[PDB]
Amino acid sequence: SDRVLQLKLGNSAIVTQEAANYCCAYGEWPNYLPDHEAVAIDKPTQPETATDRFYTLKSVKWETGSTGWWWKLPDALNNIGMFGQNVQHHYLYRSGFLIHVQCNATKFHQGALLVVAIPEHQRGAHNTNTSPGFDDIMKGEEGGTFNHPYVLDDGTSLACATIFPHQWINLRTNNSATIVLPWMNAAPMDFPLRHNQWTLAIIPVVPLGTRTTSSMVPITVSIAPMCCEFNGLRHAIT
Amino acid sequence: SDRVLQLKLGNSAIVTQEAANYCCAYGEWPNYLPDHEAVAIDKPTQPETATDRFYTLKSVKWETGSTGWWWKLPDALNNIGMFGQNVQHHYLYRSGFLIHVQCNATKFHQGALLVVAIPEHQRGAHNTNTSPGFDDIMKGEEGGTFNHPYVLDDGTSLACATIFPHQWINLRTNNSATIVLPWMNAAPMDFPLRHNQWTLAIIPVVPLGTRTTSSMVPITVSIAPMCCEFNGLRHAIT
Amino acid sequence: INFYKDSYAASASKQDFSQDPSKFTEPVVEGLKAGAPVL
Amino acid sequence: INFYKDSYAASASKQDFSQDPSKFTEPVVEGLKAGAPVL
Amino acid sequence: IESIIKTATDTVKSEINAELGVVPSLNAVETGATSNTEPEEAIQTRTVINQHGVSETLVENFLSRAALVSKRSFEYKDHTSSTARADKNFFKWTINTRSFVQLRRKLELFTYLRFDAEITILTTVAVNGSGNNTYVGLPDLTLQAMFVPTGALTPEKQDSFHWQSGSNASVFFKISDPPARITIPFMCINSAYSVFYDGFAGFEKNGLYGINPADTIGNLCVRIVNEHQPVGFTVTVRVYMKPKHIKAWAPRPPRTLPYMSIANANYKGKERAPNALSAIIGNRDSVKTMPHNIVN
Amino acid sequence: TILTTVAVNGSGNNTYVGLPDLTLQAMFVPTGALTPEKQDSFHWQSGSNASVFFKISDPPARITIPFMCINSAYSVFYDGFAGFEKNGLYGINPADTIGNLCVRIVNEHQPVGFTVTV
Amino acid sequence: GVPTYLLPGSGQFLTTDDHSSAPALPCFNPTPEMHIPGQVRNMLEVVQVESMMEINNTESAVGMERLKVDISALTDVDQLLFNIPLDIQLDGPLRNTLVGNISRYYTHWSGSLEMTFMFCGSFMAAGKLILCYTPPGGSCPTTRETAMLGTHIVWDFGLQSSVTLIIPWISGSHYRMFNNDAKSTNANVGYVTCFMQTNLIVPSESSDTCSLIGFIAAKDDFSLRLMRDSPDIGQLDHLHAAEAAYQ
Amino acid sequence: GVPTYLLPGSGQFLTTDDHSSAPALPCFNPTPEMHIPGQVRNMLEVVQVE
Amino acid sequence: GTHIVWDFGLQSSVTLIIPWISGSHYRMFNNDAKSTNANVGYVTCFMQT
Numbered sequence A, B: 001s002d003r004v005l006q007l008k009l010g011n012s013a014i015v016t017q018e019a020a021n022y023c024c025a026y027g028e029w030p031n032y033l034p035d036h037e038a039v040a041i042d043k044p045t046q047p048e049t050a051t052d053r054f055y056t057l058k059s060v061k062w063e064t065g066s067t068g069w070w071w072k073l074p075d076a077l078n079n080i081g082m083f084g085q086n087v088q089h090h091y092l093y094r095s096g097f098l099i100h101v102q103c104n105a106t107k108f109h110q111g112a113l114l115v116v117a118i119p120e121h122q123r124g125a126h127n128t129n130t131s132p133g134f135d136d137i138m139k140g141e142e143g144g145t146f147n148h149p150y151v152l153d154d155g156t157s158l159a160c161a162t163i164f165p166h167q168w169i170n171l172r173t174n175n176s177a178t179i180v181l182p183w184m185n186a187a188p189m190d191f192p193l194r195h196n197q198w199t200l201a202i203i204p205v206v207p208l209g210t211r212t213t214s215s216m217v218p219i220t221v222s223i224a225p226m227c228c229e230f231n232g233l234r235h236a237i238t
Numbered sequence C, D: 001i002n003f004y005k006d007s008y009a010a011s012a013s014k015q016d017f018s019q020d021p022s023k024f025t026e027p028v029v030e031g032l033k034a035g036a037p038v039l
Numbered sequence E: 001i002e003s004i005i006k007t008a009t010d011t012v013k014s015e016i017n018a019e020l021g022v023v024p025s026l027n028a029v030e031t032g033a034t035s036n037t038e039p040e041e042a043i044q045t046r047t048v049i050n051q052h053g054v055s056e057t058l059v060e061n062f063l064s065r066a067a068l069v070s071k072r073s074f075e076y077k078d079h080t081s082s083t084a085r086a087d088k089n090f091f092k093w094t095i096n097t098r099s100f101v102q103l104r105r106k107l108e109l110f111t112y113l114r115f116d117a118e119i120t121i122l123t124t125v126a127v128n129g130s131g132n133n134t135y136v137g138l139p140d141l142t143l144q145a146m147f148v149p150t151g152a153l154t155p156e157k158q159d160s161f162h163w164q165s166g167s168n169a170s171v172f173f174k175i176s177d178p179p180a181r182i183t184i185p186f187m188c189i190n191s192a193y194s195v196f197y198d199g200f201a202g203f204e205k206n207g208l209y210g211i212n213p214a215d216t217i218g219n220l221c222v223r224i225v226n227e228h229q230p231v232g233f234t235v236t237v238r239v240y241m242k243p244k245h246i247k248a249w250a251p252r253p254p255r256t257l258p259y260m261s262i263a264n265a266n267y268k269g270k271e272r273a274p275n276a277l278s279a280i281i282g283n284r285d286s287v288k289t290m291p292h293n294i295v296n
Numbered sequence F: 001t002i003l004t005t006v007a008v009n010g011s012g013n014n015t016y017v018g019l020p021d022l023t024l025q026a027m028f029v030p031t032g033a034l035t036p037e038k039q040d041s042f043h044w045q046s047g048s049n050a051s052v053f054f055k056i057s058d059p060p061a062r063i064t065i066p067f068m069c070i071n072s073a074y075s076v077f078y079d080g081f082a083g084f085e086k087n088g089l090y091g092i093n094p095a096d097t098i099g100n101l102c103v104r105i106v107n108e109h110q111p112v113g114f115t116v117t118v
Numbered sequence G: 001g002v003p004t005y006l007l008p009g010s011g012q013f014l015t016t017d018d019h020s021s022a023p024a025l026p027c028f029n030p031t032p033e034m035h036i037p038g039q040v041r042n043m044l045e046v047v048q049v050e051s052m053m054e055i056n057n058t059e060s061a062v063g064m065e066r067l068k069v070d071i072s073a074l075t076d077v078d079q080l081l082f083n084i085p086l087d088i089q090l091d092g093p094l095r096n097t098l099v100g101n102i103s104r105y106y107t108h109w110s111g112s113l114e115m116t117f118m119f120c121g122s123f124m125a126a127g128k129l130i131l132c133y134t135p136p137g138g139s140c141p142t143t144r145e146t147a148m149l150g151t152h153i154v155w156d157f158g159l160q161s162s163v164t165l166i167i168p169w170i171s172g173s174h175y176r177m178f179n180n181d182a183k184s185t186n187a188n189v190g191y192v193t194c195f196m197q198t199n200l201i202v203p204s205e206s207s208d209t210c211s212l213i214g215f216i217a218a219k220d221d222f223s224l225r226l227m228r229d230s231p232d233i234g235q236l237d238h239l240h241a242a243e244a245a246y247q
Numbered sequence H: 001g002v003p004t005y006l007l008p009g010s011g012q013f014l015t016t017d018d019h020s021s022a023p024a025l026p027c028f029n030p031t032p033e034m035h036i037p038g039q040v041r042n043m044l045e046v047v048q049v050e
Numbered sequence I: 001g002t003h004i005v006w007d008f009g010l011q012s013s014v015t016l017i018i019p020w021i022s023g024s025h026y027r028m029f030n031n032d033a034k035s036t037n038a039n040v041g042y043v044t045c046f047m048q049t
């Protein structure tokens, strides 16, 4: 009853038979911007199924020495499908996200992945006074990897990352994690090309292990924007 | 009507035919810890008759040059019967006490003993800046003797010791003293191996005297814990 | 004692005892029941 | 005059005239009567 | 569910439990939910009426404390032969809450904060001993603190005509007076300050990372109003900020490694544990070693 | 209540120039908190510690400290030992431990020396 | 006019005072409030969230290796696996947790704690463990027969991957103190130990070594008092670029 | 504002004065009171003891 | 064990009750004095002072 789940958005659907539950960040659900909170006065465009659908990013391989992976939103989706086109043609965007992380192995495999959505994951640089550059932060669809997951690449602690909305993929228990993210920002809308509201981090707290014949064990991320709206139409910028 | 008294607790009973009255310290009676004052949340054990009974310590001899005797509670009882076992197996204890001091002689004998229960009888050392050590304080069942009863071994006065709950054993009047002690502590419960709530002091203000053929004149102490409860069960420590 | 005309000049407000720890301790769509297995 | 928000900041309380000297002068189970011999 | 909590919860006494299909002590961490096991279900408890208050951990109380945010010393003297980098009887400070770690760490326990700021300015003076190591007494000087917002011009000298402060809020205070105090309202262009900002401040690619331009405050400009005396003094100005009327959102993992810069979250860690990059907690010999074992 | 007085040092420099009106900081450091090690220690920033800044020319500083014992009352006398071993101090209840009061002159030193009594 | 006199304390600057003060910007209209998810009003809400303990705080463990405890099959029965010091003030496995970090801003604490352990072995791995909490007074138990006399839970690995050990508030005093004397009767909480109950048994194709992750959090009977500066952060010099603010 | 003038005795520290003063620890919750035997409210109760 | 402390005085006599403390409903008058069905225990008298 809580291990099987189907998510359907637009023309996309996902089914998992080894879920635990799914997390609604801070007990909230995505919604459109209400009139009593709006700032931009132009009529927003709400593409609905054109943008509110699952986009699957490139899979990554879970290796023995893997330190972890991250993707910044909306940066990771800014060049994908109609969501990317709307982002490129509009000065302002707003949306939640539905995140589904997939990783399966055998009953002889072991490992634990922490799947956490970090709001405003401002990254720090290691052993230097220079702030991270644009190329260090904006990785797009490919995402990045943690240099020091122990401190979340920001001088904090991985052990306390559970304060953020998160699930675990414990191979003996489940093969997928689902997190629903509301709009998380100090402003009602934002410029999607210069600010990232959420960071999805997947960190192998317990390394992948087995004594059976080894196989590639990928981790796959599917993200569906929810309640997308865009304001300030102009020419494409990207 | 006030000279004869019988005390019955558990499987033990005491009768005296030469009592004066008995003292209830500060006009209070022992009781179990109420819910609105409890701190430890584990269910306490209340052995009842197994521990709430009279224990008789070793008698001491009243000599001409005797300066007095003291016993610290619960230290004196910490290795006796089921009370000792419960104390050793639990981190926290709580109880009152019923104290009965016995000393008889002939009608040709004279002497007066002050029987006083001192709350928090913190002892001082004589002619030194070093605080009393563990071995000086924790004497167990054998108890100790006053170095300077005139100042109660603490720089105070014996003459003002009547401010504490007390009786007298005046040989021409009575042969026993009875004091009922409630729980006396800043905390609802305590660790019985490191803190003593009460000190029983027997001080011969008037020395034993007679011109008839001399006999050994012992003083005997019987103490019954009342309303014992213990919390924090673990292995025996003693 | 606040005789200033602007409300933000007032002293601190230490009377908001409202709590909702479930936002961080139980942010799951399906609430869990006591004793019953979670999975 | 106490405009502080914490009650322990208040001035001293010198209005508790309740007494019970018998706690120290007569802590005996059997109360003694006037004139009648104690023993 | 939201509720009003003023004291820690009470405990209810519990009895022996042997029930098929009920395992309250078992949990599924994978769901992301913290264990809901109650003490009454793990052990046999008594009834306890808990009277312990929880007011001291209120966010308002936790954060509404005056903390040092700025400390600047400058020489009060005739600056005719001073270098261009010297504070010539005045200084300017770009306001930030990231220079002193005690307040910074507490603020960075949250992602978004909304509050008004009570500002207290404390001034001390000392006679210069360099060459003129003679004491004559401490003058009671008048100082001017002017708040210069974004886009306004900052003074360039102690007698600059910018100090006339036609519209800027300025406070004139004396050293002998109690420290000057003013309240600055929540002035962010958003509904809350961004304690952390995962973005860039400009529409080009060379803008600063990790600082939300919506939270830009401005400059605090402080000068000695008095003209210089025949002898030199050293004046130290300390600025304290106390947030109030606070709202906080999205708590975060606390900072562990030492701070390196006020401009970023760059980390290096101590040379060895504790708080090293590879070991936050101090080491013990093994996982079976009790560091402070009680023996007798 | 904290009362402060100052006097000019006469040792060698037995000359009187006047008494400076200094600023002092009294910080309450509770159990387990770090105490300052020097006059300009960064511990004086007092992020959470209660500190009071007062001047010599002001009336004596005053604050109220609440009953802070972990028990219902202080133990004026304590017939016990403070630790689970046998080497702990006798006669001092650890429940009544208060902490440290740290007092510094905020002003940097002047060319001449003074004696400050708190 | 009104006759008045100044009290002691007049003119002082108390960092914890609570008064109104003059608004520097008259008639300023703050930005309208907007709903933001994840509002926190009492820090006790944070300490109730589970966070990982650094049980494996040993020189051999680097990075997140310190956040898991490895257990292997043993050939002797009733063997000790690990213990956990329960002192939050001292530098131990509980210090860098939500509860520990928040509590170390205070001096007194009370209430129950809960430890949750997740078994991260393969589906085919099986075993039973006993987790014990020993109230203070003696040495940390080194044998199962002694440890099992205290509060404990016997944990059977299975579909539910996690078990919770409740550390009930068992204290003589209303509060305990975060004091550097870890052996003080006002501070010591006791010990937590973990023993094999039967054994870790895995098939040949599963990993012969399996990891546990330990979490800790406070229950809603937890409380803190006497705010203090946290000893977990400090600076001996100005941070880089701090001087540039004055340029 | 309110016109005021300072009286003689202003600023003095009288050891027997009785005024409220600033709480150093805001929102501190003292340990709940517990019944303890032998409470004394007036010293005349002590002098009545032999 | 079960005991009474006896103070000599005007009442010249004291009574020690030996309560029926037995696992079984009855005991047996059997020649094996150490049998669990027969042994009653002991009574001892010590000086108190």
Ligand SMILES: Cc1cc(-c2noc(C(F)(F)F)n2)ccc1OCCCc1cc(C(=O)N(C)C)no1
Pocket: E069, E095, E097, E107, E113, E117, E119, E145, E146, E147, E148, E169, E170, E171, E182, E184, E193, E194, E195, E196, E215, E217, E220, E239, E241, G024
């Ligand atoms: C320190 C200060 C001093 C003055 C001042 N001094 O003098 C005067 C004058 F001229 F009127 F007299 N004004 C004004 C404002 C000041 O700071 C404002 C604090 C706001 C803030 C934002 C953040 C943040 O970005 N967060 C939390 C992520 N933190 O705090």
Ligand SMILES: Cc1cc(-c2noc(C(F)(F)F)n2)ccc1OCCCc1cc(C(=O)N(C)C)no1
Pocket: F026, F027, F028, F029, F050, F051, F052, F063, F065, F074, F075, F076, F077, F096, F098, F101, H024
């Ligand atoms: C003297 C003092 C000064 C400060 C202080 N000074 O500055 C500040 C600052 F930083 F906020 F400004 N705080 C704080 C607390 C102080 O003492 C507390 C008295 C409590 C007590 C317990 C016992 C006892 O053990 N008994 C009765 C058995 N007696 O008294």
